[PDB]
Copies of this chain bind each other. A is one copy, B any other.
Amino acid sequence: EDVVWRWSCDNGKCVKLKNDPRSSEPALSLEACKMFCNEYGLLWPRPTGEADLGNFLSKINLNSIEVKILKKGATDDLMEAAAKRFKEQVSLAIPRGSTPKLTGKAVDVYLVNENPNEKAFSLEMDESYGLRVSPSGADRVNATITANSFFGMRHGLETLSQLFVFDDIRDHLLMVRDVNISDKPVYPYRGILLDTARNYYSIESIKRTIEAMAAVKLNTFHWHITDSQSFPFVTTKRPNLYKFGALSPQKVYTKAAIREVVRFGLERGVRVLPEFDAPAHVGEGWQDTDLTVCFKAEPWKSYCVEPPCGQLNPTKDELYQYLEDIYSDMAEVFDTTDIFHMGGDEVSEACWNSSDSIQNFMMQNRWDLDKESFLKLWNYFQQKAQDKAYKAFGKKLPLILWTSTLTNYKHIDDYLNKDDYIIQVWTTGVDPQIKGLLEKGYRLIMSNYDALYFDCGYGAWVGAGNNWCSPYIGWQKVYDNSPAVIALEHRDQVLGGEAALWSEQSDTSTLDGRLWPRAAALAERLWAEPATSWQDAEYRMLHIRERLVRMGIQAESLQPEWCYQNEGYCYS
């Protein structure tokens, strides 16, 4: 039947009241109240510059929205795709099953791309935009988006779609009447790491992930595509790696599938950044090559962080021929990325020391067999691997390594340099390594495990109890985790942050819940770096969760819906 309630703004809270017939005051639907009762309405993330939403809503005709591209260029196809996608975005205001009345004003959306040829991802790219909405004539609306690039422009389209509300009391589609917004992200790298080697993820699920990322302006999909458990990446030059390495013949990422994901990303302002983790975290796929050591080594606890063990043998010249080929095949299909992730996490000394061929190589080259001499071998590997990476991508490009024994700030300059290597941090946000690295001029991607590890909290996957980084990290904690606080005066060296979904206990079935809506908390933190805390964003976070669900995302539930309908009553 019909909705029985109405909402009224009182001290920044929409209070549910009986919609009693004996009243001359127009009843407000829940979302209509929220749009003006909340400081930033229903927007997520909130803008960084002008955020003027005015006071009124206008009824609009869904079938009368026209998008006009005013400046043509090389991004024509991307702008046209983004425009076509806009009506679809607007319909997300309308709950499934409900139908708006096809009456009201026509909306003219004007897209002004200041540099219409620009379509490359880069850390220096301009993601800023201006958004203005105002009445136009008697019967229409003028929505104008102005941006320096396509990427800023499609962010602007995202924000604009959030300015539509469905009045489910009257069945009207509404739009904010008077809008002045200026906006740009605080950090250029706003990412999610997806491990697709510990478990397989359907390419459908990967695209869906990119859809939700774009909804909250996340711009980087870090595809951790290989590990010791599987090799799903289809390398044409070294086909045995995926043939032996895949969990099944269908659990694979073909060139055509990767091209699809990469293009799907590009259209949505998301760079797809591949990782080949080396020289640890290899195993499956490398059988019969003699290019690994310790694969499935037992007892595993003596040789690696988690089963199965397995590491590359850096002493074999043929290895770098394989690496060159893998990197070249990656470069071919991951052709929007400006950066390459080379892993470098958790290298085992004990594993390398257990190999005869490796020991013979070190003794003959005048190195000892102690813990620090294996760091020489690691450098030897990384330098040669690095060379192949540059050759593959046809240029010098920034490379990423995880924090590790190698990247210890005390000796990092012996092996790496700050211009060539970005460091992905997965220590606590308080670990001494962060300041030490920043003082040496290094650029960081923040993935501190106490706030940004989305896999934490579930049961143990080896033995019993809970997994290693438990407890489960609530959105409140990921929201309050501030790179500006962690880095202080060196904050410009922080390129941004990344939520990590390791997949020992996640796959196609669970990725919607793992990522959403928690990655939206990171999205606002990185977009706006608010001085305010999670409580000030709580109401808008509850709304963005509902929006993801309307998109078809199986997002985690945060609170009873009663709390969403009754702001202020659920607190501690």
- Interface pair A472/B466, CB less than 8 Å apart: yes
> Which B-chain residue is minimally distant from A474 (CB atoms)?
B459
- Which residues of B sit under 8 angstroms from A243, Cβ to Cβ? 1, 4
Instruction: Give the distance in Å from the alpha carbon of A459 to the alpha carbon of B464 in the complex.
Output: 21
Contacts of A168 in B (CB 8 A): 248
Beta-carbon contact of B296 and A569 below 8 Å: yes
Q: Which residue of B199, B476, B572 is within 8 Å of A557 (Cβ)? A: B199
Q: Which residues of B contact A505 (CB under 8 A)?
A: 556-559
Give chain A's interface secondary structure class.
loop
Please count how many residues in chain A sit with their CB below 8 Å of the partner chain's CB atoms: 72
Most buried by B among A504, A534, A572: A572
* A1 in complex: contacting residue of B249, B457, B566, B569, CB < 8 Å: B249
Q: Given A284-B562, A308-B562, A462-B571: A472 and B470 within 8 A (CB)? A: yes
A249 to B504, CA, bound (A): 41
Considering only CB atoms, which chain B residue lies closest to A298 in the complex? B569
Complex: A563 Cα to B509 Cα, angstroms: 18
Flag A506-518 by CB within 8 Å of B: 1 or 0 each.
Answer: 1101101100000
Partner of A569, one of B95, B307, B510, B571: B307
CB distance from A544 to the nearest CB of B (A): 14
Tell me how far the C-beta of A452 lies from the nearest C-beta in chain B, rounded to whole angstroms.
14
CB pair B474–A507 under 8 Å, yes or no, is no
Pick from B200, B559, B561: contact of A561, CB below 8 A.
Answer: B200
The 9 A-B residue pairs with the shortest CB-CB distance in the complex, in nearest-first order: A459-B474, A463-B572, A462-B572, A229-B562, A509-B554, A464-B476, A461-B559, A198-B560, A1-B249
Residues of A in contact with B (beta carbons under 8 Å apart):
1-4, 18, 95, 97, 168, 198-200, 229-230, 243-244, 247-250, 284, 287, 296, 298, 300, 307-308, 457-466, 470-477, 503-507, 509-510, 512-513, 534, 549, 553-563, 565-566, 569-572
Q: List 27 A-B contacts (CB under 8 A).
A: A4-B249, A168-B248, A198-B560, A199-B557, A199-B560, A229-B560, A230-B561, A230-B562, A247-B562, A296-B566, A300-B569, A307-B563, A457-B457, A457-B471, A457-B472, A458-B474, A460-B572, A461-B560, A462-B572, A464-B474, A466-B471, A470-B471, A503-B557, A504-B559, A509-B549, A510-B557, A512-B554
Knowing that A461-B563, A506-B557 are A-B contacts, what are 9 other residue pairs whose CB atoms are under 8 Å apart, sorted by A's residue number? A199-B560, A229-B560, A308-B566, A470-B472, A505-B559, A507-B557, A509-B553, A510-B556, A512-B554
